[PDB]
Amino acid sequence: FELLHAPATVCGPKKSTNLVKNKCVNFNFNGLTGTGVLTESNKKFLPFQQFGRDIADTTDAVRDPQTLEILDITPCSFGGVSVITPGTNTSNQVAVL
Amino acid sequence: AYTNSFTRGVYYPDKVFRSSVLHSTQDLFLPFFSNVTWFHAIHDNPVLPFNDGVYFASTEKSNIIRGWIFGTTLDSKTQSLLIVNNATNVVIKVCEFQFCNDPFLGVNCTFEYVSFKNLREFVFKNIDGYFKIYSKHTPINLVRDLPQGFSALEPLVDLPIGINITRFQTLLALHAAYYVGYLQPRTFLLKYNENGTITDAVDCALDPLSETKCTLKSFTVEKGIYQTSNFRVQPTESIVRFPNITNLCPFGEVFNATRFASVYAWNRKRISNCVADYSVLYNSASFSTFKCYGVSPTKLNDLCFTNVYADSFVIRGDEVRQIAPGQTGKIADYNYKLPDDFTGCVIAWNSNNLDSKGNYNYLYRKPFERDIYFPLQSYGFQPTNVGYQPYRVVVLSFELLHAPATVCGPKKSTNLVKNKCVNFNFNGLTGTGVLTESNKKFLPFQQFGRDIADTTDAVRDPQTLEILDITPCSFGGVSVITPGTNTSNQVAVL
Amino acid sequence: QNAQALNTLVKQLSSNFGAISSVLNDILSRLDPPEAEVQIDRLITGRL
Amino acid sequence: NGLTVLPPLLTDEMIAQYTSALLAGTITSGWTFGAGAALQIPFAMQMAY
Numbered sequence: 201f202e203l204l205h206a207p208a209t210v211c212g213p214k215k216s217t218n219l220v221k222n223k224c225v226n227f228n229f230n231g232l233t234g235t236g237v238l239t240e241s242n243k244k245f246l247p248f249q250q251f252g253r254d255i256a257d258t259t260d261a262v263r264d265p266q267t268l269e270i271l272d273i274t275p276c277s278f279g280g281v282s283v284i285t286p287g288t289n290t291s292n293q294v295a296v297l
Numbered sequence: 298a299y300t301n302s303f304t305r306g307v308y309y310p311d312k313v314f315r316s317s318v319l320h321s322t323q324d325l326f327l328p329f330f331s332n333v334t335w336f337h338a339i340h341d342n343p344v345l346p347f348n349d350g351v352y353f354a355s356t357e358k359s360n361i362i363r364g365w366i367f368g369t370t371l372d373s374k375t376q377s378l379l380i381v382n383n384a385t386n387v388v389i390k391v392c393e394f395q396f397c398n399d400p401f402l403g404v405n406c407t408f409e410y411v412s413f414k415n416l417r418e419f420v421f422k423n424i425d426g427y428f429k430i431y432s433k434h435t436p437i438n439l440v441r442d443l444p445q446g447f448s449a450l451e452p453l454v455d456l457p458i459g460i461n462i463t464r465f466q467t468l469l470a471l472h473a474a475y476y477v478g479y480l481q482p483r484t485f486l487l488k489y490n491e492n493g494t495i496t497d498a499v500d501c502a503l504d505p506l507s508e509t510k511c512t513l514k515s516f517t518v519e520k521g522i523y524q525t526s527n528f529r530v531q532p533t534e535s536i537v538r539f540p541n542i543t544n545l546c547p548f549g550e551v552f553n554a555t556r557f558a559s560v561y562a563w564n565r566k567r568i569s570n571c572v573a574d575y576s577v578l579y580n581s582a583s584f585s586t587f588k589c590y591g592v593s594p595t596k597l598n599d600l601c602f603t604n605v606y607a608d609s610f611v612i613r614g615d616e617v618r619q620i621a622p623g624q625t626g627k628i629a630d631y632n633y634k635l636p637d638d639f640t641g642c643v644i645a646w647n648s649n650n651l652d653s654k655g656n657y658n659y660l661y662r663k664p665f666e667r668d669i670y671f672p673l674q675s676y677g678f679q680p681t682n683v684g685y686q687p688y689r690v691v692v693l694s695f696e697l698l699h700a701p702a703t704v705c706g707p708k709k710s711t712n713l714v715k716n717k718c719v720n721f722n723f724n725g726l727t728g729t730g731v732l733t734e735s736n737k738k739f740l741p742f743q744q745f746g747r748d749i750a751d752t753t754d755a756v757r758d759p760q761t762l763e764i765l766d767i768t769p770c771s772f773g774g775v776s777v778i779t780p781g782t783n784t785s786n787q788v789a790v791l
Numbered sequence: 792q793n794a795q796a797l798n799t800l801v802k803q804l805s806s807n808f809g810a811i812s813s814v815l816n817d818i819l820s821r822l823d824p825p826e827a828e829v830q831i832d833r834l835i836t837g838r839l
Numbered sequence: 840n841g842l843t844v845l846p847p848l849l850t851d852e853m854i855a856q857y858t859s860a861l862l863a864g865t866i867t868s869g870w871t872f873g874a875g876a877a878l879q880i881p882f883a884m885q886m887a888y
């Protein structure tokens with residue numbers, strides 16, 4: 201089996217679903233999975249290119265296997281959460297950043 | 298005739314999209330500013346070597362070059378890839394074609410497909426049976442030679458032909474010069490622009506400024522001194538030394554013995570002062586198993602030992618699995634124990650057609666202990682009993698401690714060369730360095746000397762008992778002294 | 792202190808780190824790649 | 840093993856020249872060479888300051 205990231209010609213028995221843009225989704229493109237927001241893009245993939253990659257070797261963008269358009273993948277919003285509090289010897293009220 | 302490859306013959310190495318990044322890659326590219334052979338088609342279609350792979354390029358005004366042939370003999374004796382482009386139809390076939398004595402086009406098949414002013418560049422490589430084709434077509438205005446410049450090639454075709462290609466030939470249309478350049482494993486730095494098109498490149502092994510661009514991942518280099526590489530001297534030839542003994546080791550006397558001992562009283566034969574050819578035992582199909590826990594069985598021919606011992610006895614077939622380091626059980630624990638750090642190979646075969654009758658002469662009961670209502674039990678081996686049949690097992694215990702080696706396999710020695718950087722092998726001990734005369738007084742029992750790092754310091758030559766010092770061949774950091782690339786491309790090397 | 796640091800670094804080359812041998816050439820001259828690589832990874836981790 | 844030692848940029852001789860300059864300055868011009876020009880001063884007067 202050749203699993204190199206390139207257009208797949210043999211795909212496993214599994215029905216596709218519709219694609220939803222600009223929302224956080226759990227995606228699977230030709231067996232490649234991850235979580236992120238799929239958006240329209242201006243990334244000009246060459247006809248032989250199926251996947252794009254970032255510095256971390258993570259997927260940057262994909263070509264939809266049914267309709268040959270390029271979708272950018274932006275990981276769903278995240279960040280650290282900090283709790284701002286007076287000492288509990290004063291109050292149990294907190295603010296969240 | 299030859300020309301300058303310049304910066305031509307770089308291709309998009311993968312189906313991965315990148316942009317605004319100075320990415321670096323290792324693949325079979327044409328080395329920058331190397332020579333490529335220049336062929337002519339005026340008033341020239343020889344067979345060329347394919348080597349590890351080919352860049353091909355041609356210049357056209359009338360579409361004279363229309364195809365390629367790839368194979369070993371190109372004469373209907375083997376499969377040969379044929380690519381032809383006639384008018385508007387590209388044709389690809391891999392048949393055992395009968396080609397002409399001198400193939401040209403006038404103006405058991407496993408695959409078939411059917412679809413100066415112009416420069417058409419191609420790359421051909423043949424990796425694990427896959428014939429990968431990259432190409433680029435571009436307009437030109439030049440008759441004399443290949444245009445200088447850069448533009449990378451996309452991959453177009455990948456044919457799973459499985460053909461061993463060593464030679465190739467072109468096909469010309471007769472009523473267009475072409476170039477053939479050999480690909481090499483050279484690392485590159487590639488400038489992907491905003492559109493993701495590779496717009497510049499730096500071959501790593503071109504020159505010391507190019508090493509500096511490869512080391513800094515940058516097409517611009519600042520004024521300074523940069524540690525691009527380590528210079529290390531290479532060896533010239535190998536030196537192989539073993540005691541010049543011609544006696545052969547008596548394995549036949551162990552494996553083809555009239556009778557094997559019982560496992561409660563197993564025999565231990567010493568093998569020494571001989572040449573041990575382990576290819577015979579390994580290649581022989583008579584063995585049910587040949588499992589090595591110490592060293593790989595194919596390395597035994599180079600490697601050699603201070604002593605080899607053959608532990609010979611009969612067990613029941615299902616118990617063969619217990620003779621191994623790390624195993625426990627009624628045989629492994631009670632009658633025949635190996636060290637869990639055991640070095641060697643366990644060889645066994647059935648004796649259902651030799652020891653079985655019933656045969657009641659085989660009795661069973663620390664590592665290598667011989668333990669000569671009772672604990673003593675025996676088997677009645679009969680030809681009609683697989684897991685209950687007798688097996689003859691010989692365990693070969695090998696002592697690899699660094700000491701004078703008495704058992705060394707069938708490998709011829711070479712002459713020894715002093716004061717030159719050489720790849721040496723002394724009794725199976727290898728390394729690279731300069732062998733010189735020494736004043737190190739090894740004691741008669743000492744064979745090898747060692748340094749603080751546990752590396753070999755000196756050795757005693759096994760044929761002539763003199764001591765040779767081993768000093769690694771001169772080495773050190775390279776550094777490239779450079780002004781900024783805004784001021785110059787000239788550099789100096791430390 | 793600097794001499795001690797270097798002497799310590801060099802002496803570490805003699806350690807096995809779980810490998811059959813501290814000597815890299817002795818692993819390579821005895822094991823086929825599928826097994827040699829395991830022993831080497833043990834030395835690489837320790838030396839790195 | 841790959842362990843090497845690089846030389847310093849300033850050799851012992853060059854260091855000696857710098858300490859010599861600093862010393863000659865200290866002796867013949869006091870602190871004036873630190874601030875600006877080395878302004879000669881009789882050593883005994885320098886000590887008076």
Ligand SMILES: *[C@@H]1O[C@H](CO)[C@@H](O)[C@H](O)[C@H]1NC(C)=O
Pocket residue numbers: 265266267
């Ligand atoms: C997916 O289906 C559409 C029809 O809705 C078709 O035009 C397209 O070629 C199909 N894609 C693939 C990859 O077969």
Ligand SMILES: *[C@@H]1O[C@H](CO)[C@@H](O)[C@H](O)[C@H]1NC(C)=O
Pocket residue numbers: 289290
């Ligand atoms: C903290 O709370 C304790 C009661 O558990 C109280 O005795 C103490 O005085 C309080 N200290 C401050 C600084 O509020």
Ligand SMILES: *[C@@H]1O[C@H](CO)[C@@H](O)[C@H](O)[C@H]1NC(C)=O
Pocket residue numbers: 299331332
């Ligand atoms: C290329 O050929 C020229 C002769 O035309 C020769 O002087 C030069 O050394 C060759 N260079 C290489 C890299 O083979």
Ligand SMILES: *[C@@H]1O[C@H](CO)[C@@H](O)[C@H](O)[C@H]1NC(C)=O
Pocket residue numbers: 383384385386388
């Ligand atoms: C090209 O060659 C094929 C045979 O391989 C032939 O059948 C075909 O007619 C030729 N050319 C064109 C333009 O059809």
Ligand SMILES: *[C@@H]1O[C@H](CO)[C@@H](O)[C@H](O)[C@H]1NC(C)=O
Pocket residue numbers: 393405
């Ligand atoms: C095709 O291959 C077989 C080997 O399986 C060989 O015997 C036969 O002669 C080949 N056919 C031709 C026309 O050479």
Ligand SMILES: *[C@@H]1O[C@H](CO)[C@@H](O)[C@H](O)[C@H]1NC(C)=O
Pocket residue numbers: 490491492493
């Ligand atoms: C990219 O392509 C555009 C045309 O679509 C061109 O104007 C531009 O110069 C090219 N180079 C870049 C921006 O990478």
Ligand SMILES: *[C@@H]1O[C@H](CO)[C@@H](O)[C@H](O)[C@H]1NC(C)=O
Pocket residue numbers: 548549550552553577578581
């Ligand atoms: C045992 O005898 C057979 C011939 O029957 C021979 O091929 C084999 O090599 C011998 N074994 C050894 C270890 O010499």
Ligand SMILES: *[C@@H]1O[C@H](CO)[C@@H](O)[C@H](O)[C@H]1NC(C)=O
Pocket residue numbers: 540541542759760761
């Ligand atoms: C190697 O051969 C020489 C004869 O040239 C002999 O004197 C010497 O003893 C041999 N060495 C060994 C280890 O057998």
